[PDB]
Paper text:
The histamine H4 receptor (H4R) plays key role in immune cell function and is a highly valued target for treating allergic and inflammatory diseases. In this work, we resolve the cryo-EM structures of H4R/Gi complexes bound with the endogenous ligand histamine, and synthetic agonists clobenpropit, VUF6884, and clozapine. The overall structures of the H4R/Gi complexes closely resemble the conventional GPCR/G-protein complex, where the receptor/G-protein interaction primarily occurs through the Gα subunit of Gi. In the cryo-EM structures, the G-protein engagement is mainly mediated by the insertion of αH5 into the intracellular cavity of H4R.
While histamine only occupies half of the ligand binding pocket on the TM7 side, the synthetic agonists clobenpropit, VUF6884, and clozapine cover the whole orthosteric pocket. VUF6884 is a more potent analog of clozapine at H4R24 and only differs from clozapine by the position of the chlorine atom and a substitution of the nitrogen atom with an oxygen atom at the dibenzodiazepine ring. Similar to the mutagenesis data observed with clobenpropit, mutant D943.32A/Q cannot interact anymore with the two ligands, while mutants in the π-π network significantly reduce receptor binding of VUF6884 and clozapine. Conversely, other mutations have minimal or negligible effects on receptor binding and activation by clozapine and its analog. Interestingly, Q347A increases clozapine affinity and activity, while the effect is minimal with VUF6884.
Author numbering:
A (entry chain R): 12 to 157, 162 to 206, 293 to 372
B (entry chain C): 5 to 340
C (entry chain B): 3 to 55, 182 to 234, 240 to 353
D (entry chain E): 2 to 119, 138 to 247
E (entry chain D): 10 to 62
């Protein structure tokens, strides 16, 4: 029909929004020389990971599903491997930020009296990128017998289960545990107090809830389909809704963490 | 009571003597001169490296070198053509409030909340910078200090006294008294035989250096006087108080001439300075931004905006080529 | 790059100076700085001598891997307005008041302590700086209230003439003066004389301030 | 202030050597250091340069790859390492001091040298000038390229060497006069041609004069003018 | 003694040689006119002579 030009516009708009937001965060770091602390380096890492998704993978996916199947096997391998690496990197950056914030309150004396700030930061960033690669890359490369361009390991539910586990079960547990400990360490020291305790509870709830809601449905629905009916033909609208909901998280991400922090807000205000 | 009555008589004598000479004012006569129009200035350089608030600066006499002080416990000497750092000097007590630069280029001085004025020698045969003197004897914090030559210095304190020191000996030579409140500033003359000082009792006094007695008293401000400067000719000076006004006082006519104020301004002044021809009066403010006034018309708001805290210090070179400002946000900027 | 050789040597020197400045600034932010305040003979000397012992006076000490610098300022005989804004970034204010001086009109001393406490709390430079309050000389007050109850200066007090009732009444009287209850707290102590409690209390209050600041920075 | 170096002596073909210099009485960690050379029968010749912070090293083209320069700050000691020495290396060696910021005076304190035994050009127009006390004299030298840079400087230096002593700065940057030097010397000129002048000659002002440029590396000396 | 100090200071400040206010205004205007051409902030210099670009 002629309703394929209306969806193309929305996809392009979403790509533009993602790239714009993460470019702003990168500019905010680069401009100022006062934002030299652990937290700001981790926010930079997150912005970079989201920016590459915003630029590469959204435009190329439009003509494939709307106009023309102009990929070839090698281009599909490239596209899928890039997309998987970027998404897993974003999740692991979120876990790292939460761990930092928990150390900032469980132990304040040492967190104030540390001066190791040269190479450990880059060490950790490269480590999370390497782990993010090792999560997916080898399996997509190995897949040979793989129709729409999607990984072949879908044909067995074991790989789906293990991959979804190491993607989505450990991060949720860790984020929940760290945020509950932060809340308790404030609440024990409470005694107008009620309002601030409730505010802290609300904010931690919002963070954990947005994470879980954005990232669960696609994984659960995929594994459920794979366990009975290896359907790679036409699929209902639910599959596409979940598919796009998972990318919506990379547009949500830089509104919550970088823009609530105060010195980033001041740097944004200056420019 | 007789002494009080005669003092009232003398005060009325001074009042009426001042009244007698008001044949005409400054505002009614200069209204036939072309104005500056609009003056626009741009930031040529930006000097970075101080971390905490910046409290004072001072230009060198070769118009290229500059000194500044902050609460970090550091003095810094800059080259202002290439934004290079020539020297960086660590202090003993970090509660510094003033600094000065020797007219020959060999020495610098600084003081603060520890009641002591220290003097440093820049040109040795060992390559470093050493403390040459410490001058002590005040009982309150130090507000200002200005070299006379390589061997004589002047200081003002917050215990109502000013002093003239002979650096080589280390002991005071003469002491000036007469204020009933803290003294906040001072400004030497071009010939270095007189000076003026304003105090927290809302009055300014004119002192003679060689003999040691007060000569003149200027009154009129509503609150304390926070910054003072001296007109290039040598016959007038201008004050800035904490009631959002500046004023011009003439040494010879012995009364006021003109006031610089505006209705949109509700904060005090922290620094004043002049231009080489005497046709611009620059004033820092608490409103976060400097401001340029036409000295012979008392009207302009040609702001040099661009600071993110209150403007604590400013200065104009010895030939007229630049203006430097520094403020509580730790950045010092050069305008041309 | 059209610089000559001497300009390049100058550039190298300037960059080394920048490096030194930045490192010193890093080191100067891992410390704790406290401003010490009191009143006329409020027994502030005792506090100074107990914990690890012209113009400003500085005391430095180290406890449990924290470095405290305490600034005592009693020798400045000028007004507070020309002088206080220099201490705007201080971590906390340690305040001393004496209890036994409720019947020592010089109009008693408790009224001066209240007036100066109310002046300090509501200051515009200290909109988020917390206070650590010390009450001194509990003993002599306890014997002196055996003969003269608090009614000599608190006619509206409606409790018995015992120790803990009077102590709690005075503490609540001094802590009710706050007007910024949502932004900063006030900590209280009854000055011990036998051990390091006077230092452990400061350590704990400072740890609490640090933790709350870390949480409030993240907008969390 | 004092710099004392040692390590010189006599060597065979091949081999290697190491010379050291000890500083005493000043802040050796803020100064750049040069090694300079003088043949037993000729003028001077620059050798090597190491800066303050050890981030910059320069050599001469007749020695690069065979010589190495190093410093040691906690003990205040400077080293030169020479490899596979040949006949052309015979000389006296001097350690020299210099500090660069806006308005400083480089090349002002020289060591005392040690004996080791095995491009813009400047021309000294003379080789010997006989005069009598009480007269004024003038010495001249010439260049091949303009020494006036665009920032306003003129990197011309005038040095003196009395019989049996180390040299001594007289005039830096073509017009300025060092500290500790009697104010009867002067120097002037214009691009590529320069002249030093002395008024009211006295004894203990007899020896060889040198004119040097520092506009770019390498640095080049002149033949030397002998006044007696 | 303080009253005597005030008496002496008022005596020293009472005997002042004085000039008209218009004289001061005229002298200020004359100084501003005579040296006006050498102010690099009233009449900016061409950029070939400006040392700050
Ligand atoms: C394009 N959207 C949807 C697809 N996608 C997936 N990413 C990863 C990546 C890594 C892991 Cl360990 C799990 C994932 O979860 C999936 C599980 C099954 C199928 C696809 C994904 C990327 C985002």
């Amino acid at each position: 029909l002629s309703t394929r030009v209306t969806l193309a516009f929305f996809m392009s708009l979403v790509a533009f929004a993602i790239m714009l937001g993460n470019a702003l965060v990168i500019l905010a770091f680069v401009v100022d020389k006062n934002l030299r602390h652990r937290s700001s380096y981790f926010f930079l890492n997150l912005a970079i990971s989201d920016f590459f998704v915003g630029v590469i993978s959204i435009p190329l996916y439009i003509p494939h599903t709307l106009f023309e199947w102009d990929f070839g096997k090698e281009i599909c391998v490239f596209w899928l491997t890039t997309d998987y690496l970027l998404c897993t990197a974003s999740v692991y950056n979120i876990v790292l930020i939460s761990y930092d914030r928990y150390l900032s309150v469980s132990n304040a004396v040492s967190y104030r009296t540390q001066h190791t700030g040269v190479l450990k930061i880059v060490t950790l960033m490269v480590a999370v990128w390497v782990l993010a690669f090792l999560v997916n890359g080898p399996m997509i490369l190995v897949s040979e017998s793989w129709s729409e361009c999607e990984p072949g390991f879908f044909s067995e539910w074991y790989i789906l289960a293990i991959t979804s586990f190491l993607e989505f079960v450990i991060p949720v547990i860790l984020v929940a545990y760290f945020n509950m400990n932060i809340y308790w360490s404030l609440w024990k020291r409470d005694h107008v107090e009620l309002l601030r305790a409730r505010r802290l509870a609300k904010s931690l709830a919002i963070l954990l809830g947005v994470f879980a809601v954005c990232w669960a449905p696609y994984s659960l629905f995929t594994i459920v389909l794979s366990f009975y009916s290896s359907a790679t033909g036409p699929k209902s609208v639910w599959y596409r809704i979940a598919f796009w909901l998972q990318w919506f998280n990379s547009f949500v991400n830089p509104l919550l963490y970088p823009l609530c922090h105060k010195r980033f807000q001041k740097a944004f205000l200056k420019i | 009571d007789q002494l009080r009555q005669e003092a009232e008589q003398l005060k009325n004598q001074i009042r009426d003597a001042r009244k007698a000479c008001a044949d005409a004012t400054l505002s009614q006569i200069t209204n036939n001169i072309d104005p500056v129009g609009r003056i626009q200035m741009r930031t040529r350089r930006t000097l970075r490296g101080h971390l905490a608030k910046i409290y004072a600066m001072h230009w060198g006499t070769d118009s290229r070198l500059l000194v500044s002080a902050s609460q970090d416990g550091k003095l810094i000497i800059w080259d202002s053509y290439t934004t290079n750092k020539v020297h960086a000097i660590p202090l003993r007590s970090s509660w510094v409030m003033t600094c000065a630069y020797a007219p020959s280029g060999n020495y610098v001085a600084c003081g603060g909340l520890d009641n002591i004025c220290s003097i440093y020698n820049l040109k040795t045969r060992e390559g470093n910078v050493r403390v040459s003197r410490e001058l002590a004897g005040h009982t309150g914090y130090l507000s200002c200090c200005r070299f006379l030559d390589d061997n004589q210095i002047v200081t003002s304190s917050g215990d109502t006294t000013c002093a003239l020191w002979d650096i080589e000996t280390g002991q005071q030579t003469t002491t000036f008294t007469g204020h009933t409140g803290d003294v906040m500033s001072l400004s030497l003359a071009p010939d270095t035989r007189l000076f003026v000082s304003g105090a927290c009792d809302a009055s300014a006094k004119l002192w003679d250096v060689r003999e040691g007695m007060c000569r003149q008293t200027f009154t009129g401000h509503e609150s304390d006087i926070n910054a003072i400067c001296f007109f290039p000719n040598g016959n007038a000076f201008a004050t800035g108080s904490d009631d959002a006004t500046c004023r011009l006082f003439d040494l010879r006519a012995d009364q006021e001439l003109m006031t610089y104020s505006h209705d949109n301004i509700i904060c005090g002044i922290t620094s004043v300075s002049f231009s080489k021809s005497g046709r611009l009066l620059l004033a820092g403010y608490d409103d976060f931004n400097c401001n340029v006034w036409d000295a012979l018309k008392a009207d302009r708001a040609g702001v040099l905006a661009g600071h993110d805290n209150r403007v604590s210090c400013l200065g104009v070179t010895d030939d007229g080529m630049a203006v430097a400002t520094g403020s509580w946000d730790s950045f010092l900027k050069i305008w041309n | 790059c059209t610089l000559s050789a001497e300009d390049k040597a100058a550039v190298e020197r300037s960059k080394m100076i920048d490096r030194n400045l930045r490192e010193d600034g890093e080191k100067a932010a891992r410390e704790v700085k406290l401003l010490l305040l009191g009143a006329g003979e409020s027994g502030k000397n005792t506090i100074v001598k107990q914990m690890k012992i012209t113009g400003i006076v500085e005391t430095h000490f180290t406890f449990k891997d924290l470095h405290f610098k305490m600034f005592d300022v009693g020798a400045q005989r000028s007004e507070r307005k020309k002088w206080i804004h220099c201490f705007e970034g201080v971590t906390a204010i340690i305040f001393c008041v004496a209890l036994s001086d409720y019947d020592l009109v010089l109009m008693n001393r408790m009224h001066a302590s209240m007036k100066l406490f109310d002046s300090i709390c509501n200051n515009k430079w200290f909109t988020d700086t917390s206070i650590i309050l010390f009450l001194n000389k509990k003993d002599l007050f306890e014997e002196k209230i055996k003969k003269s109850p608090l009614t000599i200066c608190y006619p509206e007090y409606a409790g018995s003439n015992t120790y803990e009732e009077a102590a709690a009444y005075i503490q609540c009287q001094f802590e009710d003066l706050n007007k910024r209850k949502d932004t900063k707290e006030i900590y209280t102590h009854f000055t011990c004389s036998t051990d390091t409690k006077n230092v452990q209390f400061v350590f704990d209050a400072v740890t609490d301030v640090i933790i709350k600041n870390n949480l409030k920075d993240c907008g969390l | 202030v004092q710099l004392v170096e040692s390590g010189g002596g006599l060597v065979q073909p091949g081999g290697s050597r190491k010379l050291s210099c000890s500083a005493s009485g000043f802040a050796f960690s803020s100064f750049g250091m040069h090694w300079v050379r003088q043949a037993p029968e000729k003028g001077l010749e620059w050798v090597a340069y190491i800066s303050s912070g050890s981030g910059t090293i320069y050599y001469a083209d007749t020695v690069k790859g065979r010589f190495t320069i190093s410093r040691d700050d906690p003990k205040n000691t400077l080293f030169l390492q020479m490899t596979s020495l040949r006949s052309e290396d015979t000389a006296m060696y001097y350690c020299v001091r210099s500090i660069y910021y806006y308005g400083s005076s480089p090349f002002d304190f020289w060591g005392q040298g040690t004996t080791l035994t095995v491009d813009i050009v400047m021309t000294q127009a003379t080789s010997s000038v006989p005069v009598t006390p009480g007269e004024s004299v003038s010495i001249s030298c010439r260049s091949s390229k303009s020494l006036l840079h665009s920032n306003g400087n003129t990197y011309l230096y005038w040095f003196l060497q009395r019989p049996g002593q180390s040299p001594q700065l007289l005039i830096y940057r073509m017009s300025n006069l060092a500290s500790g030097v009697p104010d009867r010397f002067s120097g002037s000129g214009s691009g590529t041609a320069f002249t030093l002048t002395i008024s009211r000659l006295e004894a203990e002002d007899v020896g060889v004069y040198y004119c040097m440029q520092h506009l770019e590396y390498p640095l080049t000396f002149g033949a030397g003018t002998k006044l007696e | 003694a303080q009253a005597r100090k005030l008496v002496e200071q008022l005596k020293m400040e009472a005997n002042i040689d004085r000039i008209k206010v218009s004289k001061a205004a005229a002298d200020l205007m004359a100084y501003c006119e005579a040296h006006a051409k050498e102010d690099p902030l009233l009449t900016p210099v061409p950029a070939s002579e400006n040392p700050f670009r």
